[PDB]
Amino acid sequence: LVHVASVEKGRSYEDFQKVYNAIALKLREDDEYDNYIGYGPVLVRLAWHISGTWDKHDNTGGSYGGTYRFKKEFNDPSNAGLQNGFKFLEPIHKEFPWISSGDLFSLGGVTAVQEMQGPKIPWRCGRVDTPEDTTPDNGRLPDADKDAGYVRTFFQRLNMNDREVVALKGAHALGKTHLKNSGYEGPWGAANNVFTNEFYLNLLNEDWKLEKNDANNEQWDSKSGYMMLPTDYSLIQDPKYLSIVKEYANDQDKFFKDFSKAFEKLLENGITFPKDAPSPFIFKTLEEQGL
Numbered sequence: 035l036v037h038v039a040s041v042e043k044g045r046s047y048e049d050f051q052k053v054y055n056a057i058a059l060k061l062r063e064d065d066e067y068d069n070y071i072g073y074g075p076v077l078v079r080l081a082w083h084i085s086g087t088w089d090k091h092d093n094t095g096g097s098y099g100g101t102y103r104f105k106k107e108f109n110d111p112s113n114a115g116l117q118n119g120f121k122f123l124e125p126i127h128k129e130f131p132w133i134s135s136g137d138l139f140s141l142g143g144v145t146a147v148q149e150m151q152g153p154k155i156p157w158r159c160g161r162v163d164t165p166e167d168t169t170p171d172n173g174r175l176p177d178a179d180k181d182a183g184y185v186r187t188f189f190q191r192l193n194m195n196d197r198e199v200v201a202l203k204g205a206h207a208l209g210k211t212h213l214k215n216s217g218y219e220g221p222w223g224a225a226n227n228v229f230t231n232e233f234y235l236n237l238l239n240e241d242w243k244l245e246k247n248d249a250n251n252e253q254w255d256s257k258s259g260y261m262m263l264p265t266d267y268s269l270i271q272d273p274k275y276l277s278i279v280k281e282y283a284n285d286q287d288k289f290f291k292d293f294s295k296a297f298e299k300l301l302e303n304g305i306t307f308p309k310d311a312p313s314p315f316i317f318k319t320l321e322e323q324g325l
């Protein structure tokens with residue numbers, strides 16, 4: 035498979051900035067979701083899950099085709115709870131019907147991070163909706179009950195190396211696990227709708243205790259009311275992941291620079307960009323626009 039990026043006909047930066055502004059104004063307005071965390075965390079999880087089905091060996095899956103819109107991918111057990119982010123973005127797609135699905139799903143992720151005080155993520159347009167038979171089969175997204183060797187091997191399929199994996203995992207400072215969605219319960223930290231290096235500080239500074247939860251799954255719990263998944267706790271069990279966790283705990287700007295590079299790569303995997311194509315767009319926040 036080759037997937038060539040094709041700009042939506044006649045659209046330039048200013049058009050996409052209007053779709054960004056619409057997603058950001060609605061994030062601001064629907065602040066009450068999930069006990070006032072808001073929709074920013076489930077929108078960066080949606081952008082990672084439509085991207086995380088990619089396989090580097092045959093170029094199948096990934097954000098290009100916007101195939102989450104189809105029943106098979108939408109109803110994947112690993113995607114439980116993402117229907118809330120889909121329902122958020124659906125009025126925005128009625129307002130701007132020209133944008134492709136993959137481009138809307140991935141721009142929701144970008145808008146969420148930037149509006150939650152995260153780094154600027156460069157974004158490229160050009161995903162094209164592909165037919166229902168290109169929808170990847172279920173089971174390509176990662177398990178949480180596993181160790182650091184699983185994590186490394188999994189992320190190799192998306193060709194992410196160690197630095198990219200630890201930077202990307204730092205998005206778990208956002209939101210929380212929900213027992214009904216995944217069999218796990220609790221937040222990773224206290225400021226869970228502001229993007230910071232808090233995941234790494236909690237992982238190095240809390241007194242974590244291994245316990246089973248109400249779904250019979252193991253998780254690491256701390257006195258503070260926070261939790262860590264087995265795959266998260268893995269990052270301090272592996273010697274190579276642990277030196278990077280410490281680096282991000284001591285330097286949030288290095289974490290923001292690397293998270294930015296890796297999250298753009300993850301959203302662009304599987305897509306060929308012609309050099310006639312526009313450069314990646316940097317969108318202004320509502321705040322930079324006085325809106």
Ligand code: HEM
Binds near residue numbers: 075203210212297
């Ligand atoms: C081995 C890797 C990963 C595993 C096993 C994993 C697993 C999980 C699980 C079990 C949840 C909770 C789902 C729920 O109950 O609602 C979750 C939530 C979340 N994940 Fe991950 N994750 C991984 C990687 C990532 C990456 C790479 C990103 C983003 C760049 C990410 C972003 C999020 C966010 C922001 C949430 C919170 C969603 C919400 O609050 O509703 N995750 N993850």
